[PDB]
Structure formats: C-alpha cells, structure tokens
C-alpha cells in the first residue's frame, strides 16, 4: 500500500480507489489561482482570465457542497443514507462492483439515474426532519 497523487487511483477498482478519497477532495478550491499576480493590471488580457478562473473555482466547489447540505452529509467523506437501493439503476452484486469496476465505468453505467437519485436523496432528508419535528 502506497499513497497516491491526485487522480492516481483512477484506474483501480472501487475497493482500492475508495481508500484515496481525501486526495481528490483536498484539491477543490485551493490552488495557485489565488496568488498575488506578481494600463490597469486587473483589466489586462490575463488579468481578466485570472479573475474568472477564481470565480470558476468557487462555483465548482459550491456545486458539490450544495448537494451535501440537502442530503444531510455536510462534513462527511463517506455518508450513509436511508434510501434503499433500487434494482433498476443497477443490479450488480458486491463483487461485480467493488472488485471489478472503476469509478469512471460505474458512474457511466448509472448515468441515466443520477438526476433521479439526487431528487430522492433530498426528499429522504426532508422526511427525516419532518419526522423529527413532530416526534420531540
């Protein structure tokens, strides 16, 4: 077992790739785009490109954080949910997923149901909060 770099475990199966999640997660907002940048210097050809690059980096980070909040997974690397798996998105067994597939192949297999699954996860978290307000 050796530590990997950014996306170094893209070609390994899930069972081995999921042990390097913090490598990809640690590089989502922080980069050299936020440097001091060494005729308005902020209006030059490459002063504008740096600016919109800074805004691009933020939106990409907030696009994922928006869902984590809705699903109740804020502050978690691996977050367990209360949504049962539906054997229409995929019916592969444990060994056919975590020992035979890469994260790229899998996310392509269920690509048709990611939008449907996202809506269910939000609805599930909403029910937990409803069931908690009228239980305490």
């Amino acid at each position, epitope marked *: 077992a050796m530590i990997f770099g950014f996306l170094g475990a893209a070609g390994s199966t899930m069972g*081995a790739a999921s042990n390097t999640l913090t490598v990809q997660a640690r590089q989502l907002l922080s980069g050299i785009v936020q440097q001091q940048s060494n005729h308005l210097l902020q209006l030059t050809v490459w002063g504008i490109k740096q600016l919109q690059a800074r805004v691009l980096a933020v939106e990409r980070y907030l696009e994922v954080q928006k869902f984590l909040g809705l699903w109740g997974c804020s502050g978690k690397i691996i977050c367990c949910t209360a949504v049962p798996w539906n054997s229409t998105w995929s019916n592969k067994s444990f060994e056919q997923i975590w*020992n*035979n597939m890469t994260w790229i192949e899998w996310e392509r297999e269920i690509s048709n149901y990611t939008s449907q699954i996202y809506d269910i996860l939000t609805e599930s978290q909403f029910q937990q909060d409803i069931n908690e307000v009228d239980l305490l």
Partner: nanobody
Amino acid sequence: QSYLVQSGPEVKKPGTAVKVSCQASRYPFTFFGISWVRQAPGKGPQWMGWISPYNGHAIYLDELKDRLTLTTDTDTTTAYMELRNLRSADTAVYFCARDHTRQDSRGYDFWGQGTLVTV
C-alpha cells in the same frame, strides 16, 4: 470478448522439460490473473499455480515449488508454463484459466481447450 488458446499436444520422453503457452487476446491482458490446473485422465482437476500478468507476482504449490516456474509476457499477451523433471505420473490435461474479477476473483471465467502431454 476474451478467449484463451493453448498450444498443441506434446509427447515428451521422461526426464525432459516441457513448456506450454496459453495465449490471451481480445481483452485487457494485465487486468485479470491467470491460473494453471491439471486434470489427469479419469480424475479431477488439480490446482498448480496462479500468476498475475500485471506485476509478475506468482503463487505455486509446494510439491511443484522446486519444479515449476510460471512466467508471463505482456507485449504479445501470452502466458507460459514450464515444467522440468517430468515424472511418469505427470501425464494430464493442462488448462489455463482466467480470473473471475480483477481482485479476489473466487472463480475462473474462461478456460483453454487443454493440452494433453504424455510422459
């Protein structure tokens, strides 16, 4: 996809050395491990060894530990098995078997047609 083909039969005098090659094609060779088993006539298969075509790591059987060595070739995607000091009881059909999955296979997906060697 994927298919393993072995060589033709051989008739080798006892005491000689025999090498049998299993050729893999139509699939990613390095992803799945390769196993060798021998099935004597009127008997059941016997497990011999398991070779990983990715990093070359090999696993052998004690009785065959000092007699059998497995090597793998990547550029032409061929698996080789050589056996030396051929006892008279080594006559059996030899198979090359592909692993079920890329990790912790617990099963063999595809086999070869077999190579009967007489000693």
